[PDB]
Amino acid sequence: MEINPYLMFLNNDVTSLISTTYPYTGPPPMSHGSSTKYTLETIKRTYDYSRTSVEKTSKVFNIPRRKFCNCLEDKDELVKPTGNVDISSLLGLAEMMEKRMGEGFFKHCVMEAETEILKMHFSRLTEGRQTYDWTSERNMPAATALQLTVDAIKETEGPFKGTTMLEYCNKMIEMLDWKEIKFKIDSIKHDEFLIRALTINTMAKDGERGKLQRRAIATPGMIVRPFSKIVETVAQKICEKLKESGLPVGGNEKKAKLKTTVTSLNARMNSDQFAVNITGDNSKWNECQQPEAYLALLAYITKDSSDLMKDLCSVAPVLFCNKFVKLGQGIRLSNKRKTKEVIIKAEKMGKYKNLMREEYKNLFEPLEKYIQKDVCFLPGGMLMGMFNMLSTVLGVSTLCYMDEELKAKGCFWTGLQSSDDFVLFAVASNWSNIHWTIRRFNAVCKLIGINMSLEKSYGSLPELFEFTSMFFDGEFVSNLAMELPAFTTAGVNEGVDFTAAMSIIKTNMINNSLSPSTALMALRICLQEFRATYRVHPWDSRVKGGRMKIINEFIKTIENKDGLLIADGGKLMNNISTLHIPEEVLKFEKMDEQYRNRVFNPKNPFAVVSTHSFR
Amino acid sequence: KFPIIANKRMLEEAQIPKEHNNVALWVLASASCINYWNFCGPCVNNSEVIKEVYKSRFGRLERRKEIMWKELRFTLVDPERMELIHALGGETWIQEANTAGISNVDQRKNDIRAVCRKVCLAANASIMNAKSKLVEYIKSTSMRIGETERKLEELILETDDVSPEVTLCKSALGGQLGKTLSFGPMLLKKISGSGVKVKDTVYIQGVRAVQFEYWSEQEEFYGEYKSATALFSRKERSLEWITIGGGINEDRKRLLAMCMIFCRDGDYFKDAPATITMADLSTKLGREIPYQYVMMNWIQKSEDNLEALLYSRGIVETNPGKMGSSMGIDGSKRAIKSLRAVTIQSGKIDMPESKEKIHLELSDNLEAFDSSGRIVATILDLPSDKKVTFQDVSFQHPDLAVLRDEKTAITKGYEALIKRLGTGDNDIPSLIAKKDYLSLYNLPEVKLMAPLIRPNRKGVYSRVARKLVSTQVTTGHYSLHELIKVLPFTYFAPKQGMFEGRLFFSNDSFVEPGVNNNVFSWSKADSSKIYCHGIAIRVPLVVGDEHMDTSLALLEGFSVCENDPRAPMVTRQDLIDVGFGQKVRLFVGQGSVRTFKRT
Amino acid sequence: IEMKKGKTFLELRDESVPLPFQTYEQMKDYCEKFKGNPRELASKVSQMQSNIKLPIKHYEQNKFRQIRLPKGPMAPYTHKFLMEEAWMFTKISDPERSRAGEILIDFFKKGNLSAIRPKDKPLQGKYPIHYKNLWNQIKAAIADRTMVINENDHSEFLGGIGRASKKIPEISLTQDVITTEGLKQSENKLPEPRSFPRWFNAEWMWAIKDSDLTGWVPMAEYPPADNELEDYAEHLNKTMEGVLQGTNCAREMGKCILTVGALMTECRLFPGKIKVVPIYARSKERKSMQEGLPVPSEMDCLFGICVKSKSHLNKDDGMYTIITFEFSIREPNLEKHQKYTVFEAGHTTVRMKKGESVIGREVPLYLYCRTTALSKIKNDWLSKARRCFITTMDTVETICLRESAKAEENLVEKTLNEKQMWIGKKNGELIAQPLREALRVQLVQQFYFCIYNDSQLEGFCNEQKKILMALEGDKKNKSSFGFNPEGLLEKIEECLINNPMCLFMAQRLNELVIEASKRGAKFFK
């Protein structure tokens, strides 16, 4: 006998079993790193996707500045990626989108974003994935680097008493002009501090479903954080009104968008037209988005609004037009037998170029011009996982295009676009005009850097496609975005994690990523993960751990074993219909009054605020 | 070690000693300190404050507690609830839980249709007494329908809900019909035309032959499936044209296949598939089946058969101006290629109504006939027998229900064993006080339960059970619970062999002494009760100590003793080579260890 | 109110701007007054469309081709432990001694380990002397009731064979030193490609069988129920657990769980020390030898021992090393077992039924020694194996609701017992089994995903989706069209090297498209 766990694909569908093809969600044990070779390859491919050769020496650094925007050359072999943007077409597409949605559309959205920003407290910045300190020169949570920055301001030129986003931003601006700056002790001059502020660091973390292509996810510093948040807030207020924008949210709403799109399509065309779908996946979505075009576009948006927003929205873009990238750890030398090994940093690789291998040399000399100390002056591209909302706006602009050249032939298109993945729906009346329409779309996309892959985009008749792991079909829309918790990496308290995991399971059920039996199994697994993390077990179990010892003696004094907490030799009582309800609220009336009042004693040395927290 | 921080005065004011039992607990502190704080510490009364502050969560809990859970059903798409939409309704399934509204009519319709199906199926056990047994079942079946205790002889008529079973059972009552038809689960109706029956043959494997019937004239009909509608015309054993107005993929495939079978269009009515030749059984256990229902059943088995049937219908390339109204092999609305003589559209086809009532005539196979044949219903167009719990019902005539399963048999056996006690002579307590256990191995009830025992290895079960019984009687230490538990096995003769630790009935269930189980359970503080699949039963007697002595109900030739970890763990097999004055631990259940000593 | 401006900021803003504009004001004025001239834009897009040659194929005139797997020696075994060739001593479980440190000592007391004395010359191996002396040191440590190993000569060597050397400061470097030592950039090696494994199918088959012992993987309890939904869920969970717990894949999952759970504690409380850890598992029920029904039997099992080197998990991306000494009663073959040094350690006994008693037949015994590394992330990935069940459960319920929804009624038991699923080919003909029996194949597939996970497998799994979608389109007669198939085949061939899971899946995918060609028209032969 032989085995082939794919023959079940013959007499069955694919929308029901495709999920079995991918491993289960969780932390990738690959440990995808950001070494110097990978970073240098990234910078090289960035400069190349720019199809130009123009430059202009700067005045603040005495360094060339490849100006790859509106200067396309080298048209040959243009099916491969390009990054040179055209401002005329860009603004034209933006105007088309405005015309469709309405006149006071951008104005209304930017006004809403503004008013939203005004009442915001800078403290929000503490909510972030990770950052890069400009003083310790490392990666840390947001709160730490924020405290460092504020206390440095205190130590150098008195405290910052603004307590608001606008005062914070103006303080950052002012700091750009200080000649000397202090921090716990040492200080630095103007140029060094400027550089540090415009630095970026390559992070290895890439956790999600689909594809972990974020080997070198870029993490900026702290100076630019608030402006990035402002621009993203505006772009978000805009992306909500767009029908073909599945980025801001997913699941139920995403299916609503899917089915609305398909039904409107079917109801739009006539009996002679027949449509088709295509599943596309943009390649190099980070090495072809330039902040210069974003700057021009934000200008076009705020062109008619309060000058406050005009100046504010024009900050983060220029901060990204000039971005030094920290080259990773430098190469190493070694003798023939490898018994001895020297280690050198990045700043010194230009000092030993005669030793490095050819492949490593030819990949380093053309960039030696742009190196400053240990970093590389990347003037464009967009490496961070930032501006996803704004990039989505540009994609939606690409899809809302229509002219008379198509109308004359009786053809058109529409579709839906996430950050870097899309689905196209072409319409025509011939098995040839479809090709013409597709090529037209690819051309208009290449005009503004948004490219498309050829080895990862396929297509067929309207019934079948895919989008953000949601394999749509005539029915039986299948999702694959099943999330789950992880305690070991994020340990907080023995009274919060469980409620968070229950809420997560509830959400996953809403999004159709989980079904009743699957949800119950997932719950009984997450409970056990919780126990094993915090080293707690029931009373029935014959464990002998420290925490159990005392529980192994002070237990006979109680009868309401059901009312006990999981954190205290308890048993589970929540179920499908009791997820929104924390276990505490569900056992309150059942806990023996003694234990109850012994738990809810605000006169203790330390979601229902329990006496189970780990400050 | 002490990651958790704490306060200082708050600690001393509570008098929390470190290393209470070698646990430091701590400014810093451990996590176990919280356990020590919640198990022995100050007592407050702040419940009201907690409830008031967290009012939203406890109000959500209250609302939740204010629910009346209802049934659920698997199906598809053709504020207070937003808090629960995750658990209220998905996409393939849904639960009809309600809050305050009540109206029991459609559930009553489901109940009546289910019981009608049940009875009409039960009548399919003979060849001659069909109508008689049917009507007698009807007259012997009453129900507490809704709130009124009505009979099942007037509801079938007073009700107005077309169905194969309603019609098949009401025709025998000379009841009015509505000119509706039922070819399987599908619902049909005539529009125009008429014809006469004609016979033809069909081969199986290429050698044999079987006769079927059809119509030779033109006639238009209105098919209909769940979330689908259609119109079509049959002519000379073949389907001329057809149109559909209900847009769903699976409902359109199944509806089209059913209408094709109804028109007998296709070559599979000339020859047969190679799968049918595997059986060639167009017959029931002892009855005959037409070719149409055999073909249908062959469809229900797998969708590959459905696709093959649809391929039998010609497939062609769609022409311009028709894509909007074409079809695909999988029910796709439009496609470059479609099937011959098809037309898709939107909007359900309005169904006509016939205001002419009639009465039919039942046949040996209960098939009803109004006129010119034109079968309206039958048992062949029913689903397979599906057991479903019926409540608010009374069914007295034989064939009402088998009501015989090993579980129920065991329940009744244990009920009889319990009643035998009877607090009197020639019963369990009298034989106990007399120390006459041999008679226990001869009572009648145990002989009635004997058939429920695993036959292959009943001797060893009997040996062990007699050991336990005698050892508990002679000494006078016993427990009525464990006795009654093992008695049903003390009937056959004993033999030598290997025992494992469980006593198996014949339905693969089991019982084990010294432990609890779904089939048999009991506990102290409720010793007057004995659970049987959760069904609490009562003891005709009262006891406070007759059960308290279980030192001999766990093992055969041993007795429990005080716990001692020094004693070595053993299994049930090595027990044979143990001696006296030699303590031994042993598992008595799931993670339950106890010490034993011989005798 | 306004964003008070500095100076350097303004200079930057005026510097970084598009090409034709040299001041923020000119660009701003050009934007704020941009007007629409759709004709020039249409001409531009047409010009771009001309200088692009976007091909669009239909998979019908230009079909796919079979994938070319690498060539060379066969891919060897990779998982840390042994699955099919394993062996285990057993003993009764005591709840008062339920810990690794105690279980190992008890196993040693009855004296079956001390009797394991590997002879000097191995069957196939590299560093026999080090492994042998280290085994002697392990027995010595266990006898002394301390799991530590004092001498650091063998463990040090076998952990350092990968890389160990001096380091010269960059500041003390000159040109004469370089010329003297011949320093160069350390050449980077690549994994050699390997062939298709001819031992994977056997492992899969063995894994699907049902184990004599049962209850390997622990699970939590079941909360109460309040309606039909939760009751149905509980029923389904109980059915699946009862079917799966009894397989061998469950045995391996339970072993990974309980052993990695011990390594993660040794790497946390005794870093920088060399400890000894057992490779054990715990059972809770078996099948009677006289009856095919389950019977309670709580028991412990010992597959081997694993030593630990110094592990801090804060340097070298938290890589540490271990060394495994496992027991087996199946002699090795040179191809599948390449990373293993093997010996023959006396004999042992096998126990089997004989009428109403148990008997024992002596057999030889082998000891498989191997070295390997681990990390903090891999520990977090193996300990969380239970999730396999979840995945498998999801597939069951996709089939058990879709169907239940097509007919609009509970068909769980019916489909589980009737719905036939293709599993493989025997004698050039398909084989089918019920769903209740194919869950096993699903579970082993998910497990193998959890074991051989690495970047290669991610690339393969992310690419195969397109082939599967193309096949689905073929089934339902849709003119699937693409842009560059050969490019996709190359993307799939570049991620196929020295990973038996990826090579096995590639081979099986080729066979799948071949078998479907009898009903599809988009693939070569």
Side-chain angles (χ1 to χ4, degrees), chain A residues 346-355 364 368, chain C residues 170 173:
Chain A
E347 53 269 22
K348 314 196 179 300
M349 297 190 304
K351 183 178 179 180
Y352 304 107
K353 59 179 66 175
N354 50 3
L355 318 186
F364 182 82
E368 186 65 13
Chain C
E170 63 188 344
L173 193 70

Side-chain angles (χ1 to χ4, degrees), chain C residues 350-495:
Chain C
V350 182
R351 295 210 153 76
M352 41 178 175
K353 68 176 181 179
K354 186 64 139 54
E356 291 289 357
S357 166
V358 175
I359 59 178
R361 185 84 141 286
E362 288 237 310
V363 300
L365 182 67
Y366 301 98
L367 191 70
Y368 285 49
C369 308
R370 177 185 172 191
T371 303
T372 173
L374 283 181
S375 304
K376 181 176 182 178
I377 309 176
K378 307 186 186 181
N379 299 3
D380 292 61
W381 182 256
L382 295 184
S383 63
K384 306 180 179 182
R386 306 188 183 85
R387 298 189 175 184
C388 296
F389 294 167
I390 296 170
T391 57
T392 304
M393 174 39 87
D394 205 323
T395 317
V396 187
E397 222 189 349
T398 46
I399 284 137
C400 294
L401 298 179
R402 302 269 180 83
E403 308 301 343
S404 305
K406 299 168 182 294
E408 184 178 2
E409 47 180 358
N410 182 280
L411 308 178
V412 180
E413 302 294 348
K414 171 171 297 311
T415 187
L416 295 159
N417 290 336
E418 303 185 1
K419 180 155 181 59
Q420 296 292 85
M421 297 267 294
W422 309 112
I423 292 300
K425 291 186 70 173
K426 194 177 186 179
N427 294 26
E429 182 177 358
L430 273 63
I431 316 297
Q433 300 173 343
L435 205 68
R436 185 189 302 274
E437 193 174 354
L439 307 194
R440 296 148 173 268
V441 176
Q442 302 297 348
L443 180 66
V444 170
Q445 185 179 4
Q446 293 295 317
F447 181 65
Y448 284 176
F449 279 7
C450 171
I451 302 315
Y452 303 96
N453 206 15
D454 60 356
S455 58
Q456 309 188 50
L457 193 69
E458 295 190 356
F460 181 94
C461 298
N462 179 275
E463 298 295 354
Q464 63 177 359
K465 150 174 67 180
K466 293 94 175 182
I467 303 183
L468 300 185
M469 300 292 286
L471 178 160
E472 184 181 14
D474 173 72
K475 282 171 55 175
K476 315 215 295 184
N477 307 320
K478 302 187 164 46
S479 282
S480 302
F481 59 96
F483 308 89
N484 182 18
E486 194 70 21
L488 170 54
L489 305 184
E490 295 173 356
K491 290 289 188 64
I492 295 168
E493 289 176 342
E494 57 174 358
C495 53

Side-chain angles (χ1 to χ4, degrees), chain B residues 416-435:
Chain B
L417 264 291
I418 298 155
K419 290 190 301 307
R420 166 63 69 172
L421 260 70
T423 324
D425 183 288
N426 184 17
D427 313 300
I428 285 95
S430 63
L431 312 193
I432 291 171
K434 190 190 306 310
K435 299 184 170 54

Side-chain angles (χ1 to χ4, degrees), chain B residues 30 91 94 102 119 134 144 171 178 197 223 273 309 338 348 445 502-503 507 530 535 562:
Chain B
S30 170
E91 201 295 329
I94 183 171
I102 70 90
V119 60
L134 158 56
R144 179 47 164 275
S171 168
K197 296 313 306 173
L309 162 57
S338 182
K348 298 303 191 69
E445 305 85 355
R502 280 177 168 173
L503 304 176
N507 66 327
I530 298 294
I535 302 176
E562 271 314 329

Side-chain angles (χ1 to χ4, degrees), chain B residues 1 64 69-72 74-76 87 92-93 95 226 250 311 329-330 332 337 386 454 456-457 461 497-498 500 502 504 508 512 565 569-571 585 587 589-591 593, chain C residues 92-96 226-230 232 269 284-285 288-296 298 355-358 401-402 404-406 408-411 414 475-478:
Chain B
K1 314 304 187 178
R64 201 287 198 185
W69 296 117
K70 305 308 305 182
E71 55 81 12
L72 82 183
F74 320 98
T75 181
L76 312 93
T92 76
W93 55 261
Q95 195 160 43
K226 289 141 291 300
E250 197 67 8
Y311 272 140
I329 190 67
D330 212 317
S332 315
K337 64 200 302 185
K386 162 159 287 191
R454 178 107 172 179
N456 180 24
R457 300 191 63 76
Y461 306 162
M498 181 191 305
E500 306 297 348
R502 280 177 168 173
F504 295 104
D508 313 308
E512 176 176 349
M569 303 294 296
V570 308
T571 176
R585 289 179 298 165
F587 286 95
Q590 184 59 220
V593 180
Chain C
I92 298 76
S93 186
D94 182 359
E96 294 176 350
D226 212 317
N227 57 86
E228 309 184 4
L229 193 75
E230 306 186 5
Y232 147 89
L269 312 189
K284 291 179 169 51
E285 47 177 2
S288 162
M289 291 174 291
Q290 307 299 345
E291 310 170 341
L293 282 60
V295 180
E298 304 190 29
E356 291 289 357
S357 166
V358 175
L401 298 179
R402 302 269 180 83
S404 305
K406 299 168 182 294
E408 184 178 2
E409 47 180 358
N410 182 280
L411 308 178
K414 171 171 297 311
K475 282 171 55 175
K476 315 215 295 184
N477 307 320
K478 302 187 164 46

Side-chain angles (χ1 to χ4, degrees), chain B residues 166-180:
Chain B
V166 173
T167 282
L168 188 62
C169 176
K170 183 144 58 180
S171 168
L173 312 190
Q176 300 297 351
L177 289 312
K179 198 177 288 296
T180 59

